């Protein structure tokens, strides 16, 4: 437990809730007003979220998930499934999005357990992760620290405040608009080998006040379902081709890489990746849905599904017609306010329209 100092009381927002009084004792206050219920302030799409997503799709060196054992394979379909699952686990355990999954699960679990066990304490929670290096030995990683505030959470939307201090090597003065909520300190210097020569690089501490609720923490501990969301789609595509070929095509998709899927765009145009790259992209998309969950994302997904289906009917040569296309566009754009994930998804939709109409 961290001592409740002045700086900890300020950063954790202690005594920041107004005193609850009766209306007959405060009806004659000059500035008594209804709670601020403004529309969220609009923001523009910045290029850092596309870089975040590009990095979340990358292949890593460490293995970020150690999956349990299952019973022995007796049926031939269980052997086929085990082979396909070995390919899937190879693709998914070495993805940066899997590290994000494990990080978020650990952090949300630690925060929920601290909020339950110590309601009146400022608990010090280290951000710990476990991985397995390329050589195969276990490795423990510290990302920083979290101090949880008071967590007398009556409802399931009640906010517990916390302070997060996270190590980084990224200069905060290169994209300052990204770091609006943070106070970034310089805490050290770091010696890094890159090819043959090491340099002394400043090591920063990104500090910020953040908040969460029991619902957000519950949905953060259950983030490993993102793996299923991607893998079920990947295997369905595999199976979709297997039925036409009348043979298991897992090896032909993963090893030969003769089959590709449009998964990105470059100055040259549309880029096609192998089934493993598609798996990592869908995993990263599910993980970013989990990390950037918002009502804007829900509205945008539900409303843009209809435009996707209309474009599909157009590509299917099914003569699609609309009634209030402008109304659908208005409903889609009502959801694009400030959330970077939703703005990135809308930019993705515009790119998809460009490529799909021509």
């Amino acid at each position: 437990n961290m001592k409740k100092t002045s700086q900890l009381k300020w950063a954790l927002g202690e005594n920041m809730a107004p005193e609850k009084v009766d209306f007959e004792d405060c009806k004659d206050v000059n500035d008594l007003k209804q709670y601020d219920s403004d529309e969220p302030e609009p923001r523009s799409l910045a290029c850092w979220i596309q870089s975040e997503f590009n990095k979340a799709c990358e292949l890593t060196d460490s293995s970020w998930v150690e999956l349990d054992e299952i019973g022995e394979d007796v049926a031939p379909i269980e052997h086929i499934a085990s082979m396909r699952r070995n390919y899937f686990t190879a693709e998914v355990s070495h993805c940066r999005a899997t590290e994000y999954i494990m990080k978020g699960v650990y952090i949300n679990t630690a925060l929920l357990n601290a909020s339950c066990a110590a309601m009146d304490d400022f608990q010090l929670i280290p951000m710990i992760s476990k991985c397995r290096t390329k050589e195969g030995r276990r490795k423990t990683n510290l990302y920083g620290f979290i101090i949880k505030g008071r967590s007398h959470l009556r409802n399931d939307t009640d906010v517990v405040n916390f302070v997060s201090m996270e190590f980084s090597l990224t200069d905060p003065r290169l994209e300052p608009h990204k770091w609006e909520k943070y106070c970034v300190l310089e805490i050290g210097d770091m010696l890094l080998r890159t090819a043959v020569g090491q340099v002394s690089r400043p090591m920063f501490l990104y500090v910020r006040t953040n908040g969460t609720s029991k619902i957000k923490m519950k949905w953060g501990m259950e983030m490993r379902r993102c793996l299923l969301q991607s893998l079920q789609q990947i295997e369905s595509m595999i199976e979709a081709e297997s039925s036409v070929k009348e043979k298991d095509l897992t090896k032909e998709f993963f090893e030969n890489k003769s089959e590709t899927w449009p998964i990105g765009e470059s100055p040259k145009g549309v880029e096609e990746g192998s089934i493993g790259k598609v798996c990592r992209t869908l995993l990263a998309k599910s993980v970013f849905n989990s990390l950037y969950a918002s009502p804007q994302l829900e509205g945008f997904s539900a409303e843009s599904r209809k435009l996707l289906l209309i474009v599909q009917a157009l590509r299917d040569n099914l003569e699609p017609g609309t009634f209030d296309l402008e109304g659908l566009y208005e409903a889609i754009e009502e959801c694009l306010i400030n959330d970077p994930w939703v703005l990135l998804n809308a930019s993705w939709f515009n790119s998809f329209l460009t490529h799909a109409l021509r």
Binding site: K214, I215, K218, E239, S243, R315
Partner: protein
């Protein structure tokens, strides 16, 4: 004794007395559900939020004397809470599991016998190979729990109530002999039972009560195959598997009938139906057991099963089943035609009507009868049942069998002729089920006639009373063998005398679903599959082999049309259409090889199966061709896409019945000029409408034009185009 003193104690007080007196038994359930607090919500979050605590479990205070407060590490296993409840840690559960008093008498195997039956079925199961294939799963109602074979769900619940709670059954009485037998055996088996009656009732519900669900199924629909549905059937793969226990003979009979009907239907199309049929029955398994081995030891009465038995030199029954009665035709013949009728509840529906005079011996277990009938007419019915309820059963069955318009108009009430999922039900079965609950109106509207009192017999009246004067219009009461056969190349089953006993035309056209999985081993594992699978796999074979098929379609088309691969398709084409369709398609193909520049790979692939029949000449122009899928005629449109065959020009992937069939490569000689030579018989489509040539006429209006003459035709899905007569 204890309870009455307890009740007196509660009535001695004031508030409990007011509760016991001012609360009826009906309101006791309301006050029992009565809860106080903030209810509960999202218990998963609660569980994650309490397992980190010290004592998340509540137990009875008796646990003080069973679990110590501390283990050998000083960790507390229970803590008193300021009542009879006590907060407890999971460490207490593990301490009981490792140090608690053990015993040799556990009730788990008996209370949960059905789960151990699942275990035994899996332990002794047999795994075959996995085959990757185009899978067609159909959503239907299947058994999740088989229950007792004799009892129904209502009867099983009645048995359970009588066994567990004898003095609480109310007005209810067990009527069936199977009900009484099972009640006796369960009451004998459950004396001195140390299990609470609730859990005994639920064990009996697991043992006896039948339960069904709608599931997407491929393969067998029996409960032994539904319990492992996740393991055997996938999106693109079938895992050959056979459960470990003993098969029910009913399921074997049903699956044998299904397989025999499919095999006979596919064999009728072959140029040598006998050899084809024998090959199929030699290459077929039913629930892991070889079909020929089943046919040599199964006493199933069915037309196609008897044809299968005759083709392999076995004795047949030459009999069938209807309404629980075994029918054996003694003399006469018949054909089958489709007839639309209006019922008594104003429901129009088509019935398979049998034309021709015939006579039958109708044998039940509690009844027996001689029937003589004509085309929708009950000429004579001499019943010889034991009891008057059995007599009434046999009379109802015979009136439904006769297909009389009186019977069809006697329908009253909310009799549905469709499934809840809007699937076609068998009309005859529906009429039988409707009249077996109450056939009063049928008996009134049947008719009466005076009796001459011959042979000493007596006639029965609509009130189920014996009368010497009058009776029903043809009904008379009375007081009361496998033959060696031949079979020819075309599956006609003659007797020792030489008169036809069976024919493929007598085989029922209903496409059913097997109870036990049917396994076929040949070049085409789909040859005796259902219609959707047959269509998908036919088109998938055509486009998978499109190189050699395309090279052969030009060099020797007759060799291509004669391939066996199109014969499972041809069994789905209506018979009377086949030749005509074939002729049409072939003429199209010929006028496609004559016009250079007109080459459409999709058109050839679409029409290629329909050219597998002996072509009959005709002057008809078809805008579509019919295939029979599950009792309905699906139409493949000659031009453009359809809902049974649609080619996506964008993805280049053909889709048949919603199942992907594969992609079509880029043919260099594809015709981009816009001209079509394989849509109309004797007409080249040159493009869109030209108003110079007059208004658009009909497809069937084009037979009076002359060669060297253009016109505008409304041929297609509302598309007017410009054609010209060659």
């Amino acid at each position: 004794m204890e309870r009455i003193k307890e009740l007196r104690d509660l009535m001695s007080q004031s508030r409990t007395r007011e509760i016991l007196t001012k609360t009826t038994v009906d309101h006791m359930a309301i006050i029992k559900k009565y809860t106080s607090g903030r209810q509960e919500k999202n218990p998963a979050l609660r569980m994650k939020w309490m397992m980190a605590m010290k004592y998340p479990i509540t137990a009875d205070k008796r646990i003080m004397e069973m679990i110590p407060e501390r283990n050998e590490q000083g960790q507390t296993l229970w803590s008193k809470t300021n009542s009879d409840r006590v907060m407890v840690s999971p460490l207490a559960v593990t301490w009981w599991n490792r140090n608690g008093p053990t015993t040799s008498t556990v009730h788990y195997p008996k209370v949960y016998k059905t789960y151990f039956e699942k275990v035994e079925r899996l332990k002794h199961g047999t795994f075959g190979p996995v085959h990757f294939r185009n899978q067609v799963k159909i959503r239907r109602r299947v058994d999740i729990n088989p229950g007792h074979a004799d009892l129904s769900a209502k009867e099983a619940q009645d048995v359970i109530m009588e066994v567990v709670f004898p003095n609480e059954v109310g007005a209810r009485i067990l009527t069936s002999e199977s009900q009484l037998t099972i009640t006796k055996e369960k009451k004998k088996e459950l004396q001195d039972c140390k299990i609470a009656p609730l859990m005994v009732a639920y064990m009996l519900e697991r043992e006896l009560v039948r339960k069904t669900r709608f599931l997407p199924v491929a393969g067998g629909t029996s409960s032994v195959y539904i319990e492992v549905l996740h393991l055997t059937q996938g999106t693109c793969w079938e895992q050959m598997y056979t459960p470990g226990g003993e098969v029910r003979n009913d399921d074997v009979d049903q699956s044998l009938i299904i397989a025999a009907r499919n095999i006979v239907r596919r064999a009728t199309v072959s140029a040598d139906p006998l050899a084809s049929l024998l090959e199929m029955c030699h290459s077929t398994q039913i629930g892991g057991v070889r079909m020929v081995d089943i046919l040599r030891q199964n006493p199933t009465e069915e037309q196609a099963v008897d044809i299968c038995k005759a083709a392999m030199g076995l004795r047949i029954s030459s009999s069938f089943s209807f309404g629980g009665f075994t029918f054996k035709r003694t003399s006469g013949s018949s054909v089958k035609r489709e007839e639309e009728v209006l019922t008594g509840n104003l429901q129009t529906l088509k019935i398979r009507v049998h034309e021709g005079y015939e006579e039958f011996t109708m044998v039940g277990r509690r009844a027996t009868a001689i029937l003589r009938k004509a085309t929708r007419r009950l000429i004579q019915l001499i019943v010889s049942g034991k009891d008057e309820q059995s007599i009434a059963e046999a009379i109802i069955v015979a009136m439904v069998f006769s297909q009389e318009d009186c019977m069809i108009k006697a329908v009253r009430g909310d009799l549905n002729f469709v499934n809840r999922a809007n699937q076609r039900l068998n009309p005859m079965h529906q009429l039988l089920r409707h009249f077996q609950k109450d056939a009063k109106v049928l008996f009134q509207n049947w008719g009466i006639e005076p009796i001459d009192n011959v042979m000493g017999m007596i006639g029965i009246l609509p009130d189920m009373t014996p009368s010497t004067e009058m009776s029903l219009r043809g009904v008379r009461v009375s007081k009361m063998e496998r033959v060696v056969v031949s079979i020819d190349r075309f599956l006609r089953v003659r007797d020792q005398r030489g008169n036809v006993l069976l024919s493929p035309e007598e085989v029922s056209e209903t496409q059913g679903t097997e109870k036990l999985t049917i396994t076929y081993s040949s070049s085409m594992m789909w040859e005796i599959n259902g219609p959707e699978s047959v269509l998908v796999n036919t088109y998938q074979w055509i486009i998978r082999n499109w190189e050699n098929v395309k090279i052969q379609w030009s060099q020797d088309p007759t060799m291509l049309y004669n391939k066996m691969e199109f014969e499972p398709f041809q069994s789905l084409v209506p018979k009377a259409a086949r030749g005509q369709y074939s002729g049409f398609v072939r003429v199209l193909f010929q006028q496609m090889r004559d016009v250079l520049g007109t080459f459409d790979t999709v058109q050839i692939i679409k029409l290629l199966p329909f050219a597998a029949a002996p072509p009959e000449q005709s002057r008809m122009q078809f805008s579509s061709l019919t295939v029979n899928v599950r009792g309905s005629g699906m139409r493949i449109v000659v031009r453009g896409n359809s809902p049974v065959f649609n080619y996506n020009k964008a993805t280049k992937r053909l889709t048949v019945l919603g199942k992907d069939a594969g992609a079509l490569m880029e043919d260099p000689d594809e015709g981009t000029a816009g001209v079509e030579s394989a849509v109309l018989r004797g007409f080249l489509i040159l493009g869109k409408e030209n108003k110079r040539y007059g208004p658009a006429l009909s497809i069937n209006e084009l037979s009076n034009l002359a060669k060297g003459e253009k016109a505008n035709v409304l041929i297609g899905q509302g598309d007017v185009v410009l054609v010209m007569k060659r």
